[PDB]
Amino acid sequence: VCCGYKLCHPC
């Protein structure tokens, strides 16, 4: 889910 680069937004 919560990777770092902003393909991943809702953590």
- The H helix count followed by the E strand count for the chain is 0, 0
HEC secondary structure over the chain: CCCCCCCCCCC
Which approach determined this entry? NMR
Measure CA of the first residue to CA of the last residue in the chain; give whole Å.
7
In sequence order, the 6+-apart residues with CB closer than 8 A to the CB of 11 are 1, 2
8 Å CB contact between 1 and 11: yes
8 Å CB contact between 8 and 2: yes
Tokens representing 1 are 């889910």
Nearest-angstrom CA–CA distance, 7 and 1: 10
Tokens representing 8 are 């991943």
8 Å CB contact between 8 and 1: yes
